Design brief:
The structure is a homodimer of 194-residue chains. Chain A contains 6 helices and 6 strands, in the order E-H-H-H-H-E-H-E-E-E-E-H. Chain A folds into 2 domains: 139 residues, Rossmann fold, CATH 3.40.50.1000; 55 residues, Ribonucleotide Reductase Protein R1, domain 1. Strand 3 of chain A pairs antiparallel with strand 3 of chain B, so a sheet runs across the interface. The structure holds uridine-5'-monophosphate (2 copies) and magnesium ion (MG) (2 copies). The site of one magnesium ion has 7 residues of chain B, from loops. Chains A, B: Dephosphorylates specifically the 5' and 2'(3')-phosphates of uracil and thymine deoxyribonucleotides, and so protects mitochondrial DNA replication from excess dTTP. Has only marginal activity towards dIMP and dGMP.
Chain lengths: 194, 194
């Protein structure tokens, strides 16, 4: 009865691409890097691995480091939009995020980040999972183009959230984008309501 | 097409009740405690709060402490059963667990625990969520009697896993139990297959 919306964290709420580039450049000032305009494909590490030998492992070391997730800046409009979305009648919002393989800091810092920006009561809305297809909802707003897993027919419509790495991608009809949080996300939600 | 089974962690895989009692008694040897045979109701803290003033907060302090989740012993047969279950043809297993409010240690230690007992490749199968009703599957094996959330009609059948706190409960037909991991869990799975 309530519309359920899954909102991805990295690349949708949290500025993973920007934070990564900044910290990569600072730690490795003598290595080549990929400017955001030149990013292509979900996997940062893979593009860096193509750019130079040993660069994938260096890239990985940035997001495995303590404070990487906690110190990510919110994307413009993301906190305000999600707060408003959650407050709408007949609308349930969950933050759905996939932790990295190295688990020392990432889960903890993602909870801390959500507490920081959305408050203690929002922690109840976090779902941490590597497989988003087993989470049921009406909508999933997520910057990754290919979302697959154990469920071959997920219940959600995946709305692609624009990011540097996907901005040039042609989608198969009838796949839809949310171009930024300034774009009209209420229209997208409303299209799914009775 | 593959049968999907959600297996709860505390009280099903990990011996939360036993670990809690042991550590409570050791930390607070002068306080009254609740023997496992006398446990009633999901909420440990609530029963302790009825037992004596200030005991709820003392109980909470045990599972908020570092190493509490990591040091939980597996329940008898749980690791062997879940390993076997995951290896079955046409069967996908996810571990579905609700972290406590205090997030400093709990998420991290639950990942570490799953790595310890099931190996690195099993980390992909963990779902951390306060709301299990938004995770879709054929079966949920979980020791908590009342499993509710944002989805009024979850896709799973909830099979109640016996625990000290629920062993006396009469369920509404046609709700079903798994009495322990020595009980015939394959029959329960098979009952859900085409
Ligand atoms: O090349 C990459 C790019 C992203 N990620 C990880 O993928 C997950 C996606 O996070 P979210 O967008 O689901 O929040 C993050 O934990 C991020 O660190 C990688 O492991 N490798
Ligand atoms: O009185 C209680 C009893 C259990 N729990 C918590 O409920 C969650 C259930 O874990 P799981 O059975 O979903 O793995 C655990 O994080 C456990 O610490 C409480 O907060 N209070
Ligand atoms: Mg993302
Ligand atoms: Mg449990």
């Amino acid at each position: 009865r309530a519309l359920r919306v899954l909102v991805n964290m990295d690349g949708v709420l949290a500025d993973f691409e920007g934070g990564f580039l900044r910290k990569f450049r600072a730690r490795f000032p003598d290595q080549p890097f990929i400017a955001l305009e030149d990013r292509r494909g979900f996997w940062v590490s893979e593009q860096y691995g193509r750019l130079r030998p040993g660069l994938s492992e260096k890239a990985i070391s940035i997001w495995e480091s303590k404070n990487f997730f906690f110190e990510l800046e919110p994307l413009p409009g993301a906190v305000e939009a999600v707060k408003e979305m959650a407050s709408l009648q007949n609308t349930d919002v969950f933050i759905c995020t996939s932790p990295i393989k190295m688990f020392k800091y990432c889960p903890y810092e993602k909870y801390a980040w959500v507490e920081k920006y959305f408050g203690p009561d929002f922690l109840e809305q976090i779902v941490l999972t590597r497989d988003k297809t087993v989470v049921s909802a009406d909508l999933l707003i997520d910057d990754r183009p290919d979302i697959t897993g154990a469920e071959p027919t997920p219940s959600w419509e995946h709305v692609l959230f624009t990011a540097c790495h996907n901005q040039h991608l042609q989608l198969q009809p009838p796949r839809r984008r949310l171009h930024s949080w300034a774009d009209d996300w209420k229209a997208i939600l409303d299209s799914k309501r009775p």
